RNA sequence: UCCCAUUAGCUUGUUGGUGAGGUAACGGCUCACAAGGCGACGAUGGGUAGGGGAACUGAGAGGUUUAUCCCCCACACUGGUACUGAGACACGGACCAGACUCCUCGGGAGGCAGCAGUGAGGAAUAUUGGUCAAUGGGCGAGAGCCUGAACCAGCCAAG
RNA sequence: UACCGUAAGAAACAGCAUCGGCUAACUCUGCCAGCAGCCAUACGGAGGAUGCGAGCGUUAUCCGGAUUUAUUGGGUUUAAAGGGUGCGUAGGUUGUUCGGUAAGUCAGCGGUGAACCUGAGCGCUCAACGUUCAGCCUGCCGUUGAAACUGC
RNA sequence: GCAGUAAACGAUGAUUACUAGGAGUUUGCCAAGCUUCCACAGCGAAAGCGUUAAGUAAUCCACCUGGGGAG
RNA sequence: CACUAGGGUAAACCCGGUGACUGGGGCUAAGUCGUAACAAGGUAGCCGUACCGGAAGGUGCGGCUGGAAA
């Protein structure tokens, strides 16, 4: 319950949608 | 239930940590063999056998030095559970608290203490250790 | 005055083939490290003259030559049925 | 776990990892200098501390730190590297071993001789 | 062929040897069929420890022996034909009282006398 | 190899005079070099026990591998560590020489055993670390018995009064009769410190 | 009697039988009906490794490695085939096919994992030494002959 | 083994701010460094002192403390760690009592299991070492019994 | 009809037996079967848990072995 | 005439390498743009999912307290 052991996995989560999300509709 | 010899050790340990002085337990042919070495030995102030329309019923009445409002039995400890099973020789034996406790196994000259199986030349399954 | 050859008993486990017998002998003893008592089989190929088993038999074995590629026991005796 | 549950699996154990791989467990390698260079320690400690790209024999890229004051070293020179790391220096896990091949010992040293190979004084 | 032989076992220097009974194939301080007794040259009398009934069960059944060890086994009195009298019994050699023959052979012992009176 | 440096540092280090007596420790006690005798910085138990394990070597001339082998031997032996050791000291063939007062000193004594002035047991030993049983016979040489030094050394010691040792001037010989009591020992040192620092 | 299930099905002489042949010998070892055999108690496949006693280490449980020493196995430039022999992966035997190398115009030789030089590689490891005096081995009726096994000497901060 | 005449032919290496055994002067980024960190009780030299000693330091590798794979001998609310929840196959465990059996278990007897390693000697002038003998065989196999417990 | 995820949480797997007191509360007759808060022994690094245990014990399953890289 | 080492052929598999070009990640300094989180961090925070933005991020829907204030 400190709080930056969850902002790094949000950070991390962030990171690797936005890379699918612009990946995608691409071939 | 899956092991009736720790659950009559749990009855009696819960028994001496609350403080109260009689305790009932369901009865069986080894159970009462445990009780009687545990009178035999000093540990148990008393105990009674009664047969009702069940298995029977074994009243455990504990032994508390007037002294010091300490019970005689310090640590009861299960050793041969159902999912390790445990046998020794005479000749490995275990000695509790340095001798100064008692280790009560079932031999097939019948269910004794460690001192008495060393004595026959006797080995068999540890049950459980008492100081 | 023979030399003993080595004899089993275990449980007829099959009986499809020609005069020849699968024998299944199960024991338990304990792990090596944990301690616990495990069970365990070890299958056999034994010759049947007669071809007088079924199937779940209890069957004493002794230990002969080469019958076979993978055949080394003959069937002394039916102690169940 | 229960006794089933480690006889079904059991225990693992992990073998530990070297702390100079490079050497691949010889004591000491022989190397060519590709660059020799000065570098910066880290936040607390300011210096400027000599480092040499070295080729090891068996192909591998290290970055040794010469040790000393003054050293002879320059690009395509034989040299012997050993392990030890420096805590400031950051990527630098080896020694250069002076007194041996082309490095020389340091010159007007009287203690510590034997660690920076200088001769016994006349 | 079975053999009787030494296998050298001391150290540089001080050979120590073990007569054993050994295939003749086998490495000089190798495999061997059984140990029967040990042999240390280097004290004067000729130290020897030897098991008589092994060593004449395998001189019984045709062990070879090599030229050390014969001799060896000669001092020792297993060499007889006592055994092989068809035509006596309890033939006692008695060998062993002239075998005996103690030599008990020393050294006179001399000194330098000290003439030091300055 | 030996110690063959200066003496009288290592008895003002220690206080006691391990190597005899001195007229230098007199208006001289302090610990060699420039700091010494400016008062004295507390020294932890470790440096204690460190300082009566070098007291003991020096005072025997024992170098640091034969006096962990010594206490190996102390440790395998049945009886007190400490004790065992300090008789196992006491039992060097230079030691029991100096004892018997064929040489003044035990580095006398030990240059004595390696040129070979030294027998035991009718047969000349030489090696300063042979270990005196009780029962031998440790003599001056024959060739040896006239020596000017010996016969100094001898010169006021009709005392011989070790109660483990007996002395015949006649043979120039003498004999151990057993290992003497830790408490019978004269040496000061504490031989409990270095059984915890070897074995901790 | 090691890891991988990010390896789950494998097997057609394969499992059994009848007979014959073959071998020192039993046997699908080979050759001319039935459909069985092995498999989550890990078959099959892939990777890695010679295996033990020692040795070291730890109170023990255990762990590391098999340098020197002993036992068993495998091999002799790479494959194939046998012959001789009581005995053969034939370590100072043969034939054939490969590749490599050497010396010669028709061709012929070698195999350094036996002991010593040297070179290369490497952080790094020695004499092209003496003797069969001892122990062992082969042959010989024995004396004896041979023995880089062995016993010794030389070199090496060297435990 | 013995005789000539000779101290004569034979000491270095690493530490010294705490942990850690050892101290002050002169220099000054150069550096040092296992850690705390230090640009001087820590860098370089000088004087001293402290380890060890024909060695002393550095690197590499392995083991122990390390219980950091925990059978002996660890954990999972919040430090890493309970599957989203059930049903259920294999597997694991099985109330009480009587009678058999003898697989597990217990006991007796027998066989089997160089060198090294452990007490006692003996020989290397001692010691390493070599060797002998007593104490280990505490695994495996065979064969006789016991029946409290587990299994059938 | 797919998809199969959540701070899908009591951040607490399922069974069995045992071991103090208070204060409320739902249901069929003082008493079960529940559902909520203080709190003995005991447990825990502490916050705390405490008969609905994180206490005393037994059986089976799941999972962990420094952080990042990296689900 | 079978048997076979070796040779050629084709495939397909496995193990490796390199390649115009094109993507993350770690570490070091700190140039540039902001201020997302830590206080009710100035719009409570976080989980899942979807869409969208130079970036931290924003918004919708459901959930949680590991949130004040009340
Ligand atoms: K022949
Ligand atoms: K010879
Ligand atoms: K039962
Ligand atoms: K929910
Ligand atoms: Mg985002
Ligand atoms: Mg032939
Ligand atoms: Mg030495
Ligand atoms: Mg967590
Ligand atoms: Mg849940
Ligand atoms: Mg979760
Ligand atoms: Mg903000
Ligand atoms: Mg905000
Ligand atoms: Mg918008």
């Given at each position: 319950?400190?709080?930056?052991?969850?902002?790094?996995?949000?950070?991390?989560?962030?990171?690797?949608?936005?890379?699918?999300?612009?990946?995608?509709?691409?071939? | 239930?899956?092991?009736?010899?720790?659950?009559?050790?749990?009855?009696?340990?819960?028994?001496?940590?609350?403080?109260?002085?009689?305790?009932?337990?369901?009865?069986?042919?080894?159970?009462?063999?445990?009780?009687?070495?545990?009178?035999?030995?000093?540990?148990?102030?008393?105990?009674?056998?009664?047969?009702?329309?069940?298995?029977?019923?074994?009243?455990?009445?504990?032994?508390?030095?007037?002294?010091?409002?300490?019970?005689?039995?310090?640590?009861?400890?299960?050793?041969?559970?159902?999912?390790?099973?445990?046998?020794?020789?005479?000749?490995?034996?275990?000695?509790?608290?340095?001798?100064?406790?008692?280790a009560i196994v079932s031999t097939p000259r019948g269910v004794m203490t460690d001192k008495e199986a060393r004595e026959l030349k006797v080995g068999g399954e540890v049950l459980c250790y008492v100081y | 005055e023979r030399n003993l050859r080595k004899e089993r008993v275990g449980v007829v486990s099959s009986n499809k083939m020609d005069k020849t017998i699968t024998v299944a002998v199960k024991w338990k003893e304990k792990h090596?490290?944990?301690?616990?008592?495990?069970?365990?089989?070890?299958?056999?190929?034994?010759?049947?003259?007669?071809?007088?088993?079924?199937?779940?038999?209890?069957?004493?074995?002794?230990?002969?030559?080469?019958?076979?590629?993978?055949?080394?026991?003959?069937?002394?005796?039916?102690?169940?049925? | 776990?229960?006794?089933?549950?480690?006889?079904?699996?059991?225990?693992?154990?992990?073998?530990?990892?070297?702390?100079?791989?490079?050497?691949?467990?010889?004591?000491?390698?022989?190397?060519?200098?590709?660059?020799?260079?000065?570098?910066?320690?880290?936040?607390?400690?300011?210096?400027?501390?000599?480092?040499?790209?070295?080729?090891?024999?068996?192909?591998?890229?290290?970055?040794?730190?010469?040790?000393?004051?003054?050293?002879?070293?320059?690009?395509?020179?034989?040299?012997?590297?050993?392990?030890?790391?420096?805590?400031?220096?950051?990527?630098?896990?080896?020694?250069?071993?002076?007194?041996?091949?082309?490095?020389?010992?340091?010159?007007?040293?009287?203690?510590?001789?034997?660690?920076?190979?200088?001769?016994?004084?006349? | 062929?079975?053999?009787?032989?030494?296998?050298?076992?001391?150290?540089?220097?001080?050979?120590?040897?073990?007569?054993?009974?050994?295939?003749?194939?086998?490495?000089?301080?190798?495999?061997?069929?059984?140990?029967?007794?040990?042999?240390?040259?280097?004290?004067?009398?000729?130290?020897?420890?030897?098991?008589?009934?092994?060593?004449?069960?395998?001189?019984?059944?045709?062990?070879?022996?090599?030229?050390?060890?014969?001799?060896?086994?000669?001092?020792?009195?297993?060499?007889?034909?006592?055994?092989?009298?068809?035509?006596?019994?309890?033939?006692?050699?008695?060998?062993?009282?002239?075998?005996?023959?103690?030599?008990?052979?020393?050294?006179?012992?001399?000194?330098?006398?000290?003439?030091?009176?300055? | 190899?030996?110690?063959?440096?200066?003496?009288?540092?290592?008895?003002?280090?220690?206080?006691?005079?391990?190597?005899?007596?001195?007229?230098?420790?007199?208006?001289?006690?302090?610990?060699?070099?420039?700091?010494?005798?400016?008062?004295?910085?507390?020294?932890?138990?470790?440096?204690?026990?460190?300082?009566?394990?070098?007291?003991?070597?020096?005072?025997?001339?024992?170098?640091?591998?034969?006096?962990?082998?010594?206490?190996?031997?102390?440790?395998?032996?049945?009886?007190?560590?400490?004790?065992?050791?300090?008789?196992?000291?006491?039992?060097?063939?230079?030691?029991?020489?100096?004892?018997?007062?064929?040489?003044?000193?035990?580095?006398?004594?030990?240059?004595?055993?390696?040129?070979?002035?030294?027998?035991?047991?009718?047969?000349?030993?030489?090696?300063?670390?042979?270990?005196?049983?009780?029962?031998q016979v440790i003599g001056v040489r024959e060739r040896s018995k006239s020596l000017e030094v010996i016969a100094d050394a001898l010169t006021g010691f009709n005392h011989s009064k070790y109660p483990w040792m007996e002395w015949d001037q006649s043979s120039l010989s003498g004999k151990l009769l057993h290992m003497p009591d830790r408490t019978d020992i004269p040496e000061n040192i504490k031989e409990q410190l270095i059984v915890?620092?070897?074995?901790?």
């Amino acid at each position: 319950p400190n709080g930056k052991k969850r902002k790094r996995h949000k950070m991390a989560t962030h990171k690797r949608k936005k890379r699918l999300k612009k990946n995608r509709h691409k071939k | 239930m899956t092991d009736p010899i720790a659950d009559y050790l749990t009855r009696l340990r819960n028994a001496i940590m609350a403080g109260h002085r009689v305790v009932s337990v369901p009865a069986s042919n080894i159970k009462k063999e445990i009780t009687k070495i545990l009178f035999d030995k000093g540990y148990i102030l008393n105990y009674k056998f009664e047969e009702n329309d069940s298995q029977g019923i074994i009243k455990v009445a504990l032994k508390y030095d007037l002294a010091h409002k300490v019970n005689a039995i310090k640590k009861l400890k299960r050793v041969s559970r159902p999912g390790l099973r445990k046998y020794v020789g005479y000749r490995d034996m275990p000695r509790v608290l340095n001798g100064l406790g008692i280790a009560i196994v079932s031999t097939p000259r019948g269910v004794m203490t460690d001192k008495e199986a060393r004595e026959l030349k006797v080995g068999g399954e540890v049950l459980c250790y008492v100081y | 005055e023979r030399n003993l050859r080595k004899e089993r008993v275990g449980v007829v486990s099959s009986n499809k083939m020609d005069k020849t017998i699968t024998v299944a002998v199960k024991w338990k003893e304990k792990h090596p490290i944990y301690g616990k008592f495990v069970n365990k089989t070890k299958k056999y190929h034994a010759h049947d003259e007669k071809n007088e088993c079924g199937i779940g038999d209890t069957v004493r074995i002794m230990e002969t030559r080469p019958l076979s590629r993978t055949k080394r026991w003959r069937l002394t005796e039916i102690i169940e049925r | 776990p229960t006794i089933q549950q480690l006889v079904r699996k059991g225990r693992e154990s992990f073998a530990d990892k070297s702390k100079s791989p490079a050497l691949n467990s010889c004591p000491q390698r022989r190397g060519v200098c590709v660059r020799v260079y000065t570098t910066t320690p880290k936040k607390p400690n300011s210096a400027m501390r000599k480092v040499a790209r070295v080729r090891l024999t068996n192909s591998k890229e290290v970055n040794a730190y010469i040790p000393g004051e003054g050293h002879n070293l320059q690009e395509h020179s034989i040299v012997l590297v050993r392990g030890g790391r420096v805590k400031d220096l950051p990527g630098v896990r080896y020694h250069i071993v002076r007194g041996t091949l082309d490095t020389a010992g340091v010159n007007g040293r009287t203690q510590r001789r034997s660690k920076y190979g200088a001769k016994r004084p006349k | 062929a079975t053999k009787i032989r030494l296998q050298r076992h001391g150290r540089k220097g001080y050979a120590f040897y073990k007569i054993v009974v050994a295939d003749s194939r086998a490495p000089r301080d190798g495999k061997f069929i059984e140990r029967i007794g040990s042999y240390n040259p280097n004290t004067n009398p000729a130290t020897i420890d030897l098991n008589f009934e092994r060593a004449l069960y395998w001189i019984g059944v045709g062990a070879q022996p090599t030229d050390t060890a014969r001799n060896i086994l000669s001092r020792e009195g297993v060499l007889m034909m006592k055994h092989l009298l068809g035509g006596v019994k309890k033939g006692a050699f008695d060998q062993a009282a002239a075998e005996n023959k103690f030599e008990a052979w020393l050294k006179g012992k001399k000194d330098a006398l000290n003439n030091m009176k300055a | 190899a030996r110690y063959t440096g200066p003496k009288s540092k290592i008895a003002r280090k220690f206080g006691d005079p391990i190597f005899g007596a001195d007229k230098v420790l007199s208006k001289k006690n302090y610990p060699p070099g420039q700091h010494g005798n400016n008062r004295r910085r507390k020294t932890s138990e470790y440096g204690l026990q460190l300082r009566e394990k070098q007291k003991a070597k020096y005072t025997y001339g024992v170098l640091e591998k034969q006096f962990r082998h010594l206490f190996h031997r102390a440790q395998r032996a049945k009886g007190v560590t400490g004790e065992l050791l300090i008789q196992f000291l006491e039992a060097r063939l230079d030691n029991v020489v100096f004892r018997l007062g064929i040489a003044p000193t035990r580095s006398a004594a030990r240059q004595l055993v390696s040129h070979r002035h030294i027998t035991v047991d009718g047969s000349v030993v030489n090696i300063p670390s042979y270990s005196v049983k009780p029962g031998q016979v440790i003599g001056v040489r024959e060739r040896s018995k006239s020596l000017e030094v010996i016969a100094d050394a001898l010169t006021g010691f009709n005392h011989s009064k070790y109660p483990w040792m007996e002395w015949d001037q006649s043979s120039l010989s003498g004999k151990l009769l057993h290992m003497p009591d830790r408490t019978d020992i004269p040496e000061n040192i504490k031989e409990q410190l270095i059984v915890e620092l070897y074995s901790k």
